[model samples]
Target: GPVPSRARVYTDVNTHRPREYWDYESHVVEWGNQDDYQLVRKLGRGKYSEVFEAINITNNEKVVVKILKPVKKKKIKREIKILENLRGGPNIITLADIVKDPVSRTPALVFEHVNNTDFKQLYQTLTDYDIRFYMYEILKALDYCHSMGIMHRDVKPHNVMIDHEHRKLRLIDWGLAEFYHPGQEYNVRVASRYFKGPELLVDYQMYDYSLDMWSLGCMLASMIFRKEPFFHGHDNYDQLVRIAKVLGTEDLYDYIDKYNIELDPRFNDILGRHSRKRWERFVHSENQHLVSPEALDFLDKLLRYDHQSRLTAREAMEHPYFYTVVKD
Candidate 1:
C-alpha cells in the first residue's frame, strides 16, 4: 500500500495558518493607484510573464517589473499572496508593489532589483569559495521559506539572482510556488524540466518541502561539475532515465517500491538498468577546481531518489559543505 509522504521538516507549515493565508483565490490584491514605475527595457520574455528593467519615479530606484501574462485570476493571486506573505524573508526577493494598467489591466509585480549577470557567463567565473557562499545564501532563503509553510517549486539557476560584486543573492520567481499543508497533493507539474525531481516525474502527488532540496541539489551539481543542467533529460520520461543513469536503476526501483510508485508504461521503451555513477567520476581537469569532499557529500545528500531521505534546507545549511563558509 502507498502511504502518503509527509515533509521531513516543517510538515505542518500551513496547518496552523489561518485559511486566509493559503486561500489565495480569496485574497484581494492591493493594486497601487499611481503609475510610478516606468519600463526602461525588456529583460526576459515567453516566460509566463514579460519581465522588465524598470524605474520607480517616486524614489528614483531601479526595480524589475514582472507583468503577468494571460492566466487565471487565482494563479495571479497565488504569486502575489506568496510573495506578500514571504515578505522580509531571508534572501527571498522583495516584492515592492502590485499595479495594474488602466488601459490593459495587466497586473505587474515591482521587485527590489539586483544587478545580476546571466548564470551562463557568471558560473564560468565562480571560484570554490564563491560557490559555497552563494549556495549557503540560497539555503538561507530556502530554509526560511520552508519554515514559513511555502515551497518555491521553481528552484533553478535562472531563478537565483546573484549580485556577485556585492556578494548578495535573491531567489526570484514565486509564480509557481505554493503553500505546504501536511499530506496535501501538489501539482507534479511544477519546476523546470531539467530541475524536476524524481517524485514529480513519477507522478507522486503527496510531496512536501523536500522537493525544493532536490532542485537545489540539481543546481549544486551543475555548478560543481560545470554542466548547465546536471540532469539533461530529453523529456520528462527521459528525465527519469538520465537520473537513473547517475543515481542508478536498482535504487530507483527501491524508492518506487517503497512509495508504491507507479510509472508510466512508456518507460518500458526508454528505461534501462544502470549502476550508480560514482560522484568522483565527475571530477576532471575542467571541474577539478570546484570538486571537494565536502561539496560531494553535500550534493550526495540532496540528489537522492527519496525526497524525505534528502537533507532539509536547515540541515543542509549545517552540513560540512559550509564549514569554511560559516566560520569567521
Candidate 2:
C-alpha cells in the first residue's frame, strides 16, 4: 500500500475532542424494560438487527422496535453512542428509548415511527420535483451528522425512510455509523456493496463524511435514472468494476494514485481503462422526465471517484438541483 498524501477532510472538526465523543466502550448503558413496547408486526430485518412495528403501551404511540441479534459488546455500544450524540439533529431518526430483555439480555432500540412506502414503489411515482425535494430532506440529515463530526457509514435506499405524503425523510440505521477524527483509519467494510465508495473499494480507510456523499450519489442516480441499483455489483470485488464501468477506470486510477492507495491484486485484470459514460446515457423514454441539467450536474459532483472531491452534504444541498425547492 502506498503512503497517503495526508489528504484529509474535516481535519479540524473532531480534533482534541473528548474520548466520549468517539469512544463507545466507556459509555454506560441505561437499559429499559422490553415489556413497555408491544410488537405489532415485523417491519424488516438485516444482517445486524430485526425491526418491528410496535406500540409504546404506556403512551399508546407507534414506534419501531429494532432488536439486535447477538453481537459484540463494543459494536452495540458504538451504535448507541452515535445515536445519543445526534439525538436532536435534523431529519435524524429519533431514538425514543432503549430496552433490553431481562431474561435473555437481548437489547432493542425504540425509534419514532414513520409510515414509509417501499422505495421500489415510491420512486416510480415521484416527479422530478419530488425527487429533488426528498433528496434535500436527506441532505438535511447528512449535513447535520457530518457537521457534528459523525459519518453515516451506511447510506443507501434501504436505510432512508420516506413518508411521501408528508414529505418527511429520516436517515436511519446508525449501527454502521461512527464519529470522525482526522487521520483515523476506519473499517472499509462499513457500507452496503452497491453504495460503497471508491475509497472503501480501493482500501483507503482514512475516509470521512464525504463517504456518505458517494452513497447519496448512488441513491440519486438510481432514483433519477429509474435503475433500482445504479451500480449492480455481484460481490465486493465486482462492486468496484461496476463503478469503473460507468465512471471509467482511468479516473479511478488517478484517484487511487492521488490518494496513494494500493490496489488489490484481484483488481488487476478487471480494472481496464474505460471512458466515463455521460449521465445522459442513462436517460430513457420511461425515465427521461427525471433527468435535467441540474440533476445531472448534481449527480456528477457527488459520484466522483475521489472521496474528497465529492460534494459534502451541505455543499450538495446548496447546488442548483434544489434551487426551486430549497431557499436560503
Candidate 3:
C-alpha cells in the first residue's frame, strides 16, 4: 500500500536551501515584551490558542494576538518558523512580532489585523467576478508557500481571511504547515474535515502541495454552487463517500489502485457504487449563470480522484475562470 511519490513541481524546493532554513529546532526566536500590546477583546479560541483583537500602543496599530495554549515548545517553534519563512508573501499574514510572558513561558504571535467579514455572510454577497478575483489571490498565496518549500496543511474558509473592502485575502494559520521533502511519508492527520483531500482520507501520507489544490477545489465548488460544503462529509470515512458520490465510485477505485491505498474496512458496507454526477447538474436557476460552463470545466479538472491529477497553484492561475477576473 505504498509507492514513492514526489511533487509534480518544485520537487527540490527545500533541497536548494540549507538544512538550517527548515531545521526549526535550531532556530532562535527573538521574543518581544508582551507589554507592548494590550488585548482589546477576545476574538475566538481554539484548542491550542486563545485569539484576541489587540492594539500596539507604540504605533496605534491594530493586530491579532494568538496566545498559544499549553503545547510542546518544538511545535511552537515550528509554527513561528513556518510563518517567518513566508512572512512577507503577497497574501500571507504578516508576523509583526512574537511576544511572550517570560514568567509563565506563554507565547503569542502578533499579526497585522484585517477587518474581515464572516465568510458565511460574505460569500453570499460576492459577485461571480468577486469570487474569481479573491480565489485567484488565494492561489497566489498557496503558490508562494509551495515555492518556499512549505505546505499549508490546513486551508479552509476559516483560515482564509478576506477583507472585501480592500479586496484583500490573507492565508493565515501556519500551525499545521510543514516543509516538503520528496519521497518522505508525512502525517496524514492534517487539514479540516470538509477540506481534507482524497489522499488524506485513504490513509496516504506521501502527499505534496497538491493537497491545498483539493481544498481550493472544494472551496470553489461551494462558492459557485451556493453550497456551504459541496462535499459535506461528517468524518474521514464519510468524506470519501461524499466525494465518491459526486465523482463516481469507479474512478475512486482506480485512484485507490494507483496508490495502492488501504481503505478503512467499514467502507465495504457503506461505499456502495454510485454514478458520477455531472457538474452542470448542480446548476439551477439560482446559480446557473454563476456556475458558468468554463467554471464547471475548471472545477472538473481540480477535484480529481488522484492527487497528482489536481492542478498546481501556478497552473490554476492560468485557468480560464480567472481570465476576465483581473484586467492585468
lDDT per model, in order? 0.91, 0.87, 0.90
- Per-residue lDDT tens digits of candidate 3, residues 118-189? 999998888899989998999999999999999998999999998888888999989999999999798998
Model 2 compared with the native: what TM-score?
0.95
TM-score for predicted model 1 compared with the true structure? 0.97
* Residue-wise C-alpha lDDT for candidate 1, range 83-102, written one tens digit per residue: 99999999999999999855
lDDT computed for candidate 3: 0.90
TM-score of each: 0.97, 0.95, 0.98
Candidate 1, 70: how far from true, in Å? 1.6
Question: Lowest summed-lDDT stretch of 10 residues in model 3?
Answer: 100-109
Query: Residue 226 in model 2: shift from native, Å?
Result: 0.6
Candidate 2 — which pairs collide? none
Query: Could you tell me the lDDT of residue 108 within candidate 1?
Result: 84
Model 1 per-residue lDDT at 309: 97
